[PDB]
Amino acid sequence: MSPSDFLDKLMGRTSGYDARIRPNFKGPPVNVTCNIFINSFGSIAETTMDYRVNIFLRQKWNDPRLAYSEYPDDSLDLDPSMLDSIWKPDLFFANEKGANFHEVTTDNKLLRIFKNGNVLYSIRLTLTLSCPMDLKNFPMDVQTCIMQLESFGYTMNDLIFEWQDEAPVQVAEGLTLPQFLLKEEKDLRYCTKHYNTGKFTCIEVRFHLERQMGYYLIQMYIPSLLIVILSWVSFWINMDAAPARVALGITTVLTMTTQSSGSRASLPKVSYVKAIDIWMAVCLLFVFSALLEYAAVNFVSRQHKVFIDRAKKIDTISRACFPLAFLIFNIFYWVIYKILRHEDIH
Amino acid sequence: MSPSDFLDKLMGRTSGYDARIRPNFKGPPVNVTCNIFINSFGSIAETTMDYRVNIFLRQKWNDPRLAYSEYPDDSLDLDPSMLDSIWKPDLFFANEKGANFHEVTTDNKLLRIFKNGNVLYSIRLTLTLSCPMDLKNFPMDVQTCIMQLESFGYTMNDLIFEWQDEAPVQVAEGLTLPQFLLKEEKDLRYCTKHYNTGKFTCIEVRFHLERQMGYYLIQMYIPSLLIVILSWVSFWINMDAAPARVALGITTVLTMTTQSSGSRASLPKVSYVKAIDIWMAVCLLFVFSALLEYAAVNFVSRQHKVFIDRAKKIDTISRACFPLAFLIFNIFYWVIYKILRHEDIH
Amino acid sequence: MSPSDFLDKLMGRTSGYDARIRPNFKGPPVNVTCNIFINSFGSIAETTMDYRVNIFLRQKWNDPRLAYSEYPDDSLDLDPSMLDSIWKPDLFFANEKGANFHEVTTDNKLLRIFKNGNVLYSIRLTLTLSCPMDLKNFPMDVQTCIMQLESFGYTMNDLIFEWQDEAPVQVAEGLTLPQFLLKEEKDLRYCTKHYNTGKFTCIEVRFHLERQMGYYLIQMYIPSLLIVILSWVSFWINMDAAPARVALGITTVLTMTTQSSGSRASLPKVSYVKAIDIWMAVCLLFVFSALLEYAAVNFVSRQHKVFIDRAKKIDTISRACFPLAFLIFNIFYWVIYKILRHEDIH
Amino acid sequence: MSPSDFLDKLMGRTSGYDARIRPNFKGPPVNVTCNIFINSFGSIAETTMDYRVNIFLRQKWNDPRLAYSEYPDDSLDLDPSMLDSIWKPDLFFANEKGANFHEVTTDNKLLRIFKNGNVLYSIRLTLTLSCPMDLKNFPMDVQTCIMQLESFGYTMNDLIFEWQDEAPVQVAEGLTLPQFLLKEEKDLRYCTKHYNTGKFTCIEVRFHLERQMGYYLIQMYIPSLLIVILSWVSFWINMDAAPARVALGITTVLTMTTQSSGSRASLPKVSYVKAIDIWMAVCLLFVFSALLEYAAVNFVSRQHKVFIDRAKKIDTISRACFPLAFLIFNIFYWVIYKILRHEDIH
Amino acid sequence: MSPSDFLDKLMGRTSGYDARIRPNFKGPPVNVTCNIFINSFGSIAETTMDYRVNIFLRQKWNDPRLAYSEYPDDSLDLDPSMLDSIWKPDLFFANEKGANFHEVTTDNKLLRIFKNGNVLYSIRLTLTLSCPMDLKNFPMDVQTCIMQLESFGYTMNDLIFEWQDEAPVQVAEGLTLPQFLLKEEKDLRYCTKHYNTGKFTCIEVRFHLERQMGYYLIQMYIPSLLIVILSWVSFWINMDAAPARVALGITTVLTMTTQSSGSRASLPKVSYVKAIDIWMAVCLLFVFSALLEYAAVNFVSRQHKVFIDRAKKIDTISRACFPLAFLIFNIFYWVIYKILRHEDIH
């Protein structure tokens, strides 16, 4: 038996097969079972509020008109040359900003037809999916990325999207992301769009990502801590030496304002306040109060000797008060964020 | 009755249907009723003077030649395979810089034909629409984005664009923009282009966006206020200590010039002045006058003791004059902008 | 009379019409009358030496083979479906780096055929035209943008490009550019390319743009003036206080070098000098000479009291010499540039 | 014998050749022998975690149906006009983010058919292949780039990919990369993907790249060494002069924090620490301890003469202690990294 | 005689002309004579190691099958409608990273057929050609850009590429590049690729570009010279005033490190050292030695009056030693680079 003509007798003008008609035209809705295989993950830009992903989308459905028994082979691995002449679901990604196929040597498509009439349809896709991100608790935040698979033309009585009981979302082995950590577990919700044109099917997955804090502690917490400790040096400097103490005040706030403005380089402008802003605002208040303390002792020292020992008493108290009032804030910052970020796991 | 041949008898060579001829060729103009559904909104770049939007454009019109009665179904959900062989309006966006369709799995199109001959045509579009923006009152400004839907080839006697009485512009639930706030109400104007080639139909919507101020107060108002308060420390420093007071003058203007140049990072170069420039120019005049005040008291102190108490009197007056003259400016800046920005709601 | 067959009898195999043959094959050259309508203007990047423009290109020419008398309608508004099967001029833009059509819903084309056989052909185009820019007199410069419309395949004996006597270049109402001002008048030159392949027709327009100076005076003239005035404070400071005066010298040149390097952020590296460089070089010489003046008085003061009053005399003279020598330069800078920029209007 | 009809008799409807059927349909798997020729290499972006490469992909396989004996020519150099009508392997690159063909004048393809029925298929490709990079030991790191060639539709019983015994990967002569060094040797592994759809063939190459350190020593090691030596000047400055010594402390850490933040300009945010961070953290601890040493001697000097010589003793010890404790660290940094980077050659 | 049928009789099924067969199939190789016309030149990015160019590629060759005598016209200006149905060389650019055609209104192609059977084929192309650049002697370097035109499918016995004796490379009048100078003369080498697939023809041109130095002297030589002269002020300052002299030391190196890091903004990271690095390293050594000189005189001054005049002697010597040792370096830097850059013209 020739391989070429079997495609003609199975589908075409001779058999009356039409690619514009769904399998069960006036019967039960077509149940399309979908699953994905994340080949790559990355390019998560916070400013643009989206992320890039490369997936292998597989779809399975039953077509009674494509049932065959002539060839004894249980499966029929078919090239994508007739993929434009069989009926396919009109799946689309609702949160997608930009997508394209892959044609590096040939069409990156797979098609298989089984004896019972089922059809396996695999494709390679690159997506740039939008993600509404909440940047509160910025250095220590669990984000949730979204992915919706919804039909465009067919309603609930025509097309239904489902997952398998077996691994709907598989991730490639060894895929490690630079700045976050992909959780093993995933959430499969069942969205359903309700437009003025009618009802449409939809399926949704959730990806939980945890940001890595190490970079931020190396960049905007340890150097800011060093700057605050540096400002604490002024209590040990001689109270008479005015240019030295003011230089320790002013140069500290000089570098701190630049660090505060530079800590929000990648963050998209957001009206709410972040935990990083709380940290660098409290540290800026600490070093500004340190210079205002000198502005107090310098005016106290000139009141003309009970004003001399009183001037030294502020320096002695502040030597063992500013580190205590900063260690308390560190406890009230590194505990209230390891409690609440732990809360709201999902 | 077969599904395949009904499309042939309804339209094609057998029925004489032509896609190059409008429905009422020599009769009343075709009334096309349009509406949109904003799926996503964002990427509003001020430098490029445009914004990005992803919409679902729906068009409805009556075609007498497409009236059918053979199939008892009231509606006929048709795949987009014959969308290139029926008559469609030549709609285009006048303010569009760049647009494309979506073909992530199949064509993102919808087509429905009813018994009376009406046609429903839905499509998914991504647009980059130009927006003439006025950046005066920059930190607190209500912008207005524009969207025009105009025919390219047909005139008023052929094609007419209209909205429904029901929700012409619908926005997806949960769509929150990073830096602005989309008003619930919308304005539907009725533009009409008048070129040398004739008259053309047009319809226009207006989107009112309010910028969020929080980011700006965290970045270029609170740190500038801290810098001005820091410059006010020099009145409390000893008048004899020349290097300390000049260091408090110069380092203040050193950081202020960088902050003034850095406050216009994203703003496209604009000839008019902004409210941010007024704020940082007045604050720069305040800290420059503070250093010029020291330049006055230092020259007054050396005139050789009536010149000593006179020198101290300027410091005592300026301790309770600069905050008063700055609080008055704050009243004359945070009231004249909450009055006028409130004015001109549209 | 049917609408469909008239296109077949007017042009096609039955009538012998060929789209590969110009109307007057062995007669007078075809005169194509062109005009444009600038829908948008902007994205004038100085670094890349080009600008972006979106235009409506209209072309008019006579085709004797397309003359019709059967339909009583004077004009024949035709969809762009046969625009690929009629003869069209092979116009191209010589200074174009990148261009594309627009297909947001359908083809953005217009075609009209009149009784006498004339053809009106309108199209929507987006262009990125290169512009050779001269950046001398940078803050105050009149640039000239260029746009050439030239045939690629046909010579002078075949194709001739012309303008109308009526408004060849029309600009959309309300089009205001961010950083420049488009002059109302335009120049229509008549270029003619002379390659080794022969002679070709060409038509050229000129757009005169004036830069807006306000941004630059807010950024690199007023702050530099404030810095120079700040350096003039050192004459009023006590001559004995060495760290204060040197701090007023050094911090001034510290900020000035950064401002001089930062004033050429967008300017493409150019070998010639600009007016901004002249301004900031003279101001840098003024503040460097101010510190060298202190380097003179400090060495004069220690020569061991005729050396004391001599030291004070330089400070008293320089108090009323540096502003006079800077006001003279301001006159010799703001007059020699309002004379010469006024000159060379075209 | 005509050249045109031989292609028709060799393949087509007359001969029954089908491009949708692999050569040995129900026999042994088709063995495809592949090799590449790297025409260009570069654009290795660390932030995006990928690299760009332009290659000449050559594939060789046997087709019994294409065996010919009519033309005495041993080889048949065929234009790519029938490349779409013969069977070709569905090769694809697994780690590819973006790829395209080349059509600068014509299709950049080559096809040769020999007497025995073998087929040579050469193509020009541009790839943007993702590379999982490990940035530990950043200034001195051996990276490994990856390239996988895997079939999409055919399994192990159908398609098998192999290399030659002769030069599978050839590099163009004179190809020198800006920032790395391509090793002469290459590793050819034999990957095999195992998806839920079945087994697939795969072949993999490895490219070993060595970063060039010179740029980094000129930028963030020599200037940091100069800064640390500059901080060592404060031991030679007079212990009484408080503003001079604190200015040598503070300005040093002022520039060092900017250098530490600026050393990670191109590096993508990574949670682990790098060797550059170790270097600039130890140097920051050295200069911060130098200023804390002054904060110790200044407080020791005022205890009211056994406190004077004790104050000078710390300065004398630190003159010959800080360079010794820094030279030891240099030995413990430039040896532990020339041992371990040498280790793990592959 | 009709114009339409002559194309059919000259080429097509009736005449047996095949576009898949070269003119002399089993005879001498086809000699294709090529020449270019650079319409635009620019966008030479050093970081990406490539440049952009827009050219008019003209090719001339003889086709005996296209010889005609029926039409008395010596030349036959043909539209590009049959350019896909005649034989054309498979030219490609070996060093090209990205290229595209131009279709702004129609296809930007030209075709002419003469009586003897010769064919003239002109096309418009935009290229992004890679250029291996050597950045040593960066401010004053003669670069060489490359352009290779090589066949992809045909070998030496089939296709041969040649230039004319008359102007192979023509440049448009008035083309002035921003940052370099294009030499009038050009080098035409004769490359010949030798792959494992066989021998291929190739032709190569060379473009010599000279960088303009003016921008660099305005940016990183004159301000660095001013900084070094500023550091020379410290010799004239009083030796007792410690904070003034150290502030002149430290602020100088503070600005110099930023200038040294900022002088390599556009340069791609390169392991070798550049002339700019030599210049700013020597100037950094000069200002660091100036501060170390103060660190010497300050320690010499306190040795308890033979130590006082000895301290002043270093200041007096260094007043007339540092400018002499810097002028000698200027001679040994501005002569050794005007000798060697002059050498190696090609």
Ligand SMILES: *[C@@H]1O[C@H](CO)[C@@H](O[C@@H]2O[C@H](CO)[C@@H](O)[C@H](O)[C@H]2NC(C)=O)[C@H](O)[C@H]1NC(C)=O
């Ligand atoms: C697609 O799935 C739906 C839901 O599982 C099927 O609908 C059910 O079909 C069974 C079998 O006839 C009925 O007994 C149920 O009453 C149906 N339920 C509903 C809610 O309709 C449907 O038959 C499936 N279609 C196909 C083609 O497999």
Ligand SMILES: *[C@@H]1O[C@H](CO)[C@@H](O[C@@H]2O[C@H](CO)[C@@H](O)[C@H](O)[C@H]2NC(C)=O)[C@H](O)[C@H]1NC(C)=O
């Ligand atoms: C499209 O809408 C216009 C305006 O509503 C219609 O024009 C009117 O048609 C009615 C019915 O014949 C007339 O009585 C009016 O005089 C018309 N007004 C104008 C200004 O023309 C038009 O008929 C509609 N066309 C279709 C096909 O529905």
Ligand SMILES: *[C@@H]1O[C@H](CO)[C@@H](O[C@@H]2O[C@H](CO)[C@@H](O)[C@H](O)[C@H]2NC(C)=O)[C@H](O)[C@H]1NC(C)=O
């Ligand atoms: C296109 O325009 C040219 C120039 O106006 C026309 O050429 C002239 O035609 C008139 C009418 O026959 C002659 O009297 C002149 O001698 C011609 N001048 C030249 C320089 O050739 C030409 O006829 C026009 N062609 C068409 C088709 O309108």
Ligand SMILES: *[C@@H]1O[C@H](CO)[C@@H](O[C@@H]2O[C@H](CO)[C@@H](O)[C@H](O)[C@H]2NC(C)=O)[C@H](O)[C@H]1NC(C)=O
């Ligand atoms: C492709 O290569 C495989 C492996 O070399 C070949 O499979 C072998 O073929 C020989 C010859 O018939 C047998 O003796 C071996 O037992 C086979 N081994 C396996 C593991 O199958 C195969 O024949 C080759 N196919 C072609 C078309 O050359």
Ligand SMILES: *[C@@H]1O[C@H](CO)[C@@H](O[C@@H]2O[C@H](CO)[C@@H](O)[C@H](O)[C@H]2NC(C)=O)[C@H](O)[C@H]1NC(C)=O
């Ligand atoms: C293409 O050019 C080559 C080289 O000029 C030609 O080859 C020569 O042809 C002449 C004329 O028959 C012979 O006498 C020489 O011996 C040939 N030399 C070589 C090295 O082959 C060739 O004939 C030209 N082909 C065409 C079609 O013009």
